[PDB]
């Protein structure tokens, strides 16, 4: 039954920002930041994108942490659609992060999105509470895509395309996997094209699970966004995507 399955990441996050002022994480969870304004318009600018599709989403999958529930947010208001939380698509942390953080649950988050979130859905997997290499999470992702799709289309068995909002390194991991590699660590062609992974960038893939074959027919697009591609990011990167150390990087050198 699923045919499309659109993938994008969270928007502009607040730790983001050159100098502050940076709001604590909403949840008092660790990493948990919100978006930067600049995240939330990029936000909305996605969500006008989506309702102008002539294949809308008919559900959107969110990451369990603030930033993917709230760059969903606006999309669920355009199309009125229903939103579930799967930590399956949480967020990558490496075994040596000195804290491994863990999302808020449906009643907490709940508090922050009233209403917005659909209860009763399990995860189709829970990432490691010690963290992952990067071959755990491609490892993660690649179990979690027969649990999601078989639970998905024997619940919703007139769905045909569906949204994923999750975080860089899950998206590609999560894409690659579709597309059957065997690693994020790679590119997708001779071109050496690979994954695009801007914030608020999104994926679109057009078809028994494992035995089906998908094509990426929309790779990481921005163009819908005023200020184009920002902070994209791939395996090839050395630190966690959106991490402090990543945008220092990026600013020690622009």
């Known amino acids: 039954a699923i045919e499309n399955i659109y993938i994008a990441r969270h928007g502009y996050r607040s730790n983001w920002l050159p100098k502050g002022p940076y ?13 930067s304004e600049h995240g939330v318009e990029q936000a909305h600018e996605l969500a006008n994108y989506i309702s102008k599709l002539d294949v809308k989403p008919e559900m959107i ?5 603030y930033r993917c529930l709230e760059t969903s947010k606006p999309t669920v208001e355009a199309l ?14 490496k075994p040596d992060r000195p804290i491994i953080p863990e999302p808020a649950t449906h009643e907490v988050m709940s508090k922050f999105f009233p209403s917005m979130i659909s209860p009763d859905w399990e995860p189709s997997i829970i990432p490691s509470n010690k963290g992952e290499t990067e071959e755990d ?5 690649h179990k979690f895509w027969p ?54 960038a999104i994926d679109k893939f057009e078809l028994p699970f494992e035995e089906r ?10 163009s819908f966004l005023t200020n184009g591609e920002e902070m994209n ?22």
């Open 23 to 35: 709001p604590p994480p909403p949840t008092g969870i660790d990493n948990d930041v919100p978006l």
């Open 61 to 65: 999958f969110s990451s369990p942490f």
């Open 80 to 93: 009125k659609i229903p939103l579930y939380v799967d930590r399956g698509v949480g967020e990558w942390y």
């Open 137 to 141: 999470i491609f490892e993660r992702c």
């Open 147 to 200: 649990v999601f799709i078989d639970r998905v289309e024997r619940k919703f068995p007139n769905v045909k395309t569906i949204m994923i909002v999750t975080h860089a390194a899950t998206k590609s991991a999560l894409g690659m996997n579709l597309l059957k590699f065997s690693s994020a660590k790679e590119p997708i062609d001779n071109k050496g094209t690979f994954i695009r992974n801007g914030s608020c």
């Open 213 to 222: 074959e998908w094509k990426l027919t929309m790779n990481g697009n921005t």
């Open 233 to 254: 990011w791939t395996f090839m990167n050395a630190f966690e995507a959106g991490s402090d150390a990543d945008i220092k990087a990026r600013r020690a050198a622009e």
